[model samples]
Target: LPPAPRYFQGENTAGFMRPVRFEGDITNLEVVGEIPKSIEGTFYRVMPEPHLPSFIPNDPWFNGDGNISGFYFKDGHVDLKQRYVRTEKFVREAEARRSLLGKYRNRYTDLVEFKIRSTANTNIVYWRGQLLALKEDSPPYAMDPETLETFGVYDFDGQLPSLTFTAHPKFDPVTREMVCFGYEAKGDGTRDICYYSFGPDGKIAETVWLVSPVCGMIHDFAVTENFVIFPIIPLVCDVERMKQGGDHWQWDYSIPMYIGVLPRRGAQGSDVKWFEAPHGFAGHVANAFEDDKGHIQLQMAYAKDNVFFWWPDANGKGPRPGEVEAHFANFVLDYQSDKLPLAEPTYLVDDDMEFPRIDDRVATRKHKHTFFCIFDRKPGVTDFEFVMPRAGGGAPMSNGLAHLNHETGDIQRYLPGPRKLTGECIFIPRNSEAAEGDGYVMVLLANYEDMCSELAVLDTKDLTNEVALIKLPVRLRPGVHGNWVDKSDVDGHPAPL
Candidate 1:
């Protein structure tokens, strides 16, 4: 029904990065050690798997068909199941048996007659009793939480007029509402931004449209008691270049990095107050909360220098960010202040850190300590390899996890050391109604020697000891973002397939 086919050839393109045609459920995946009885519910991950070879050799790994996998934990055991989201593009490709799709953001390269295709390959989220597979380019596709079945695309009951939605949606634990924004919402190349919210009632009462100070790839943001934060950096987008067979993103040096602060739903905010951030580019917000005075205290893994180079430049050359590793940094800003300069941010952690996370139970709310995977000058893996294959490159792999005590100005470390590569750390409060940082931190680690993966649990209050370790028989490729929905929410019941 579309183009004949496409082709490519490149080394370093196999193993975990290789296309996986495998899709199904394994009732009995071997869980190596004892999983805590305290831990329950499903850990859902949305992965992008291409049905056809990339149109270009050594293409970026972001674009792929969406695959939703869930590692269900209950009664001290872990099980696995997965399914591909049957998107329009995937269905079309299935009928034709090839990748009829084209360039990443370039619609011009795709089949002109083909229907829209969103791989839905970025993140997995649960909302309003529905499992969602989200990508940056299109509306989220609702999948059956029980069986990971693709339902269809979600447009909030026709309330969402935006052309696309963000992969990162902030869920307010207190209000049971989600704060989501779509950049380039006017279209693929526009600076227009659109915001949306739906509560447990699951009704899209309205859509508030805004514009970014600069149009760029806004991968992540921060939410607090009273405001929303958008960190816009130099990674700008160009639809003109894309239509002409060029990359979608280019690092524009002419712009100043900014944090566009906006009010929360039902707040007194009139406009998106913008403030200049210390120049750096890492698309993640550790967390943020509003102080009593309405000044936003936002702490994130600040990229003091190194930004990975896959994004190119407008001058037809590859662009690279800073050489310094992203460290833990905090910025205090009051947008209404007409003062000469903003508060000077302090880089808190000394160990090289990136991909920061906190127990989002306190999301958009105040948080005390934050956790991150640290790459402190190890002799392997570097280059912000957050979403790539684990190669034996000489770049430093994050062999340990760092705990930042914001209260005491202390940084603690649990040295898993160079032998192990750790993923982002997730905190599970001891009890659902536990105090902040009063729980356990779970780190999913891959043993480099054996290629198998393990889950390490460290005491949140005591960072030195890895209290528990649970091993897995299968070697899971590094995964994208995932969330843990309490088993109580789903009743430990598998949704009908």
Candidate 2:
């Protein structure tokens, strides 16, 4: 194979952000702190690493191929396994030894054979005896949970009727049903949306097909016991512009934001309600629940403008410095009436934050605590910035993790020293009977100054003290999202022999 182009050898691929393109297993990793004997599970994460230079030299880092990394924990020790998801795009690129696809999601820029190929690099989840590597624009590619081996595309045994699947699927704590949806369900530039809920037996129990009022990037959503809310931002898409080799999405403030509410169990296209909202941005939802009055409260990271700087506004205007800052916000929806309720969000924490998470047990219900990767902007903490698509205009990277208590309104943070960056933190309940927020949090740490990465385990009840530090030899580019799965959940699978 030929050497990569000069463009990939620079900022995007430099230091901790560089693509490893590595696959293997490493046993008995070095640990700084004592690992909890009670904690046993695998922390699965996926990052983008384009095996070959992109057809577009200036492609966004978010467009790289998916690299799955699994951290296995058992008997107070850890093992590491890394593998690249062999999606059709990955296999084709490997055979050709170069990038066959063109711009991100721009079907017109690629050969028909490679058109609409999935990267499957955004998120990973274990569902119904299958580990699914997901990308919002394409169906999930299943994988072996133990070996991280790709098992080809999984559409719930041909039960899923859509071509795309969401990366942020939620599981009902009580019912164990997987609640997921897909946007642009028909194809690229289409307004179709498909919602489905699968039972514990992996059968589709409920389905709803509807058209979104605003056909934009509905990356993540909120789910309550009775309702599913989709916050549609104005990252508009145009087929004509994409045909001209333009971006798949462009920020358009002209289109007002709309929130769609659908009944989780019994609902149809006509029953779906669209609530008027202001023009803003919401990338991920933390938790949501309903009150006795039929009002719903949703928590998430809310920003005033576009956080994705790669694709500027439709007019070519980029995001300003403060425009990318997102804060923890809570919005109340009183949607039992016919009137269009003006949904206004209340800022919970003033700091810049995103990638909010809650205990998996409390999903679709009231959650007392939420964990977040926050950027406090303290001196020496926010030292590095991603140089590629965002360059100087994107949202500030998080430097630490925060634990916010909704009842006391007190916020506790865990900063793993300075000059370090933290990825999304997943909370693990200390035990099945532990109270809410009484657990541990696992997050990936990127030490940019040293060009290496490590995994930090901290106690959720007290973030000031570190529980364990599992260090690694190679650097992992900051991952987009990940989850922690208990050993007993996967048929009591034992640790690797």
Candidate 3:
């Protein structure tokens, strides 16, 4: 059981980017059509496998191990599960069977020994009643939103003083609170930036203790019932370049992109408000608002250069040649202006995209539509081995699922042809009085022409058909962000063991 590493045999770990350790229950998936009983609930995704092999072998497909998965929809049927967010470095490397986590947040490339620096792989949020499992560095691990069961880290009891948290937390559909932050918040590579505000019952209402004009990698941020953005890109982050073994992030084309902005009702840290913009690239965020002259705007996925070919640049340069596509921009910000404008981008879904989603019941307001994931480009289509991988082991491209229309600039795609691919899509609402990009978008197709991974579900008012797909009894890898919970909001918990 020991020979498998050559980093699982190449390119984001071989074919459909292999790496799926498989966990538990399935309770019948294979559905093809009908599953929408007002789109029930529980979608919770999170992926990153690495069950062993990686004390440093091609490590970086966002450094695996967080798993999570759930699906659950009941009555219209759909119930799957999948676990592994055991973190104490996944139960001390699953009681020593291999890979003592070497690099990827580099705890100085450890060989053993742990203090929970978080491989809570990327994301999975549900706030208040539990099920956090995020990974900015460390802090969230709580589970049990109906048994994905891991119950560990969750700081707010120690009253949350941040040691790094944020796998992009947002939600403020009119003060249902939870607007988070934590960029290197006084731990590794520190530039300390705390900003939290959780309270839909999880407590900790407002913290604010900002810093970051540098130590980068702020994965995602943008909230706005009255501001809370941070977008400081340049990917930089350094801890003396991870104690000289380097690579904690480095795409420094000599810095310049800043955008801080504060005030989500009661703000301090000098009332935070920075604004710089000139050095390209934006990443996630698909919504933010305050228009009608109050001006904020936001909307992301932009790029003029550096779309992370595995954090290159700094003489290890990579993407340049039209510099790795990505556009859907529109920056704006203006608490009476100081310079954070950048808006001449309107190709909504003209292809090459990244994870953008909207309609968390119009989170932050003035919303129109905007859901994403594309890559398209199929003319004469010479099989470039079906592209779509790049989760920072960079350069693979994207595939399918779009839905634009910020005031009818229109787009609506879903494309499940040509080897299928797509990750991160989430947008489900057909209930609480619907209408705002009304119900279902789900996404996670992968299919490399029948190799596996399904769960599709379209219909945000017909984004090219497919109302249900489900299917996925095994092989499912590629993922990074996901959410949606509404079985009457966790249905008073307890069940599933």
Tens-place lDDT per residue, model 3, 1-497, is 32435446556677666786878888868788887776677888888888877746667677778889888887788888888888888788778777776788878777765787588888888776778898988889899977787978889788887888889887766557778888888888888899888776777888889887688877888887788888877888777878888888888887767778898877788878777777877788887889888878888887767777767877887685334788777777787665555445455555778888877767777788888887756662223454433322432345677788777687877877666667888887776666777777888776765668898888788888887788785767877887878776442221211
lDDT of 3 at 119: 82
Q: Compared to the true structure, candidate 1 yields what TM-score?
A: 0.88
Instruction: Give a tens-digit lDDT track for model 1, residues 1-497.
Output: 44343543343235434455457876655554456778777777665666677554454556667777687777777777878888888888788777777777777778645545588888888887788788887888988888887889887777776778788888776776778888888777788877777776777743677777677778888888767888876788777878788877787656656778777665432477767765667556888888888888888777643264566456645434334477677788776776524455787777777768776767777777788888765445433343235442212246678877788977778776455677666666666567776677777676755566676767777876776666665555555667667775542212211
lDDT of each: 0.69, 0.81, 0.76
Cα misplacement distance, residue 419 of candidate 1 (Å): 3.9
All candidates: CA RMSD (Å): 4.5, 3.5, 21.8
Question: Candidate 1 — which residues are off by over 4 angstroms?
Answer: 1-12, 112-115, 266-270, 304-306, 316-324, 339-344, 379-397, 415-417, 461-470, 490-497
TM-score (C-alpha) between model 3 and the true structure: 0.32
The residue ranges of model 2 lying beyond 4 angstroms of the native Cα positions read: 1-7, 321-323, 383-396, 490-497
lDDT of 2: 0.81
| 1-497: candidate 2 lDDT, tens digit per residue | 22336346545565556667889998999999998989889999998888887756556677789999999999889999999999888998788777877778887777546634889999999886667999999999999988898989887888998888999888887777889999999998898889888887888987899898767998998889889998887798899999888989999877666788899887887778888777788768998899778898988887778887677887788775445788888888876867765556888888888899887677888888888888776666565443223221112367788888988999998888666778888877787677878878989887655667889989876897788998888887777889888876653211111
Worst 10 residues of 3 by lDDT: 488-497
